[PDB]
Amino acid sequence: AGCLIGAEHVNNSYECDIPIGAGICASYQTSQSIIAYTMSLGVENSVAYSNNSIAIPTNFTISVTTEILPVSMTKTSVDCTMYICGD
């Protein structure tokens, strides 16, 4: 993305905290300092796939997640003449 000055490049990989670009992100970590690193895409996880193995849940959880959606906005009106030629 360019030249980065003032961030210590780190060979470790963490979640993206401040996006810099091209997979490079920056964080503030320990004597704390700004560090730059290649972001980790999730935790990698290979599925134990085979042609005769199946994974079945023995339990469950009830999750309640919040979603927020704007519905309307403020009803504004502008008197064009007053705005341009106020009185």
Partner 1 sequence: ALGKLQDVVNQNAQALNTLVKQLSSNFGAISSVLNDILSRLDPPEAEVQIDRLITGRLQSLQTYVTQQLIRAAEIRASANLAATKMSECVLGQSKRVDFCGKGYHLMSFPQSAPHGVVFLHVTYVPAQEKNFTTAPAICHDGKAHFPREGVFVSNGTHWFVTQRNFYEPQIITTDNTFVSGNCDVVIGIVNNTVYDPLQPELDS
Partner 2 sequence: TMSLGVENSVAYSNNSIAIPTNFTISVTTEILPVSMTKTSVDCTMYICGDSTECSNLLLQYGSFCTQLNRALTGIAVEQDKNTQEVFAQVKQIYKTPPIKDFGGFNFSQILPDPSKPSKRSFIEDLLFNKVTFNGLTVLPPLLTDEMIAQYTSALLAGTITSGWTFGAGAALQIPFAMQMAYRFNGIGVTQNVLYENQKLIANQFNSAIGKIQDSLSSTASALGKLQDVVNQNAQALNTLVKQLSSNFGAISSVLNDILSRLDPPEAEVQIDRLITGRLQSLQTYVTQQLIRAAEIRASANLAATKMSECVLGQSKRVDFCGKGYHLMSFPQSAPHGVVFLHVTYVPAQEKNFTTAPAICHDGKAHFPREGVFVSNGTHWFVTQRNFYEPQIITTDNTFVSGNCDVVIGIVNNTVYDP
Partner 3 sequence: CTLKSFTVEKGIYQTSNFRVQPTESIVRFPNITNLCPFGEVFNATRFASVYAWNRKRISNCVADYSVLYNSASFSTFKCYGVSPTKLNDLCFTNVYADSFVIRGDEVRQIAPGQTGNIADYNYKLPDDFTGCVIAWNSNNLDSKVGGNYNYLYRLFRKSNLKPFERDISTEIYQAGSTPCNGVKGFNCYFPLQSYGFQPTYGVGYQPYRVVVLSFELLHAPATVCGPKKSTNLVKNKCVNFNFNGLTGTGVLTESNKKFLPFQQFGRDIADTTDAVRDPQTLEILDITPCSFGGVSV
Ligand X SMILES: *[C@@H]1O[C@H](CO)[C@@H](O[C@@H]2O[C@H](CO)[C@@H](O)[C@H](O)[C@H]2NC(C)=O)[C@H](O)[C@H]1NC(C)=O
Contact footprint for partner 1 (CB under 8 A): 48, 51-74, 76, 78, 80, 83-86
Closest approach of ligand NAG to the CB of residue 74, in Å? 51
Which residues, other chains included, contact 5 with Cβ-Cβ below 8 Å and sequence gap of 6+?
none
* H/E element, 82: helix 80-85
Q: Does 45 bind ligand NAG (CB under 6 A)?
A: no
Our CB check for partner 2 shows the closer of 21 and 70 to be 21
Q: How far out from the chain centre does Cα 6 lie?
A: 23
Contacts to ligand NAG by CB under 6 A: 9, 11, 48, 51
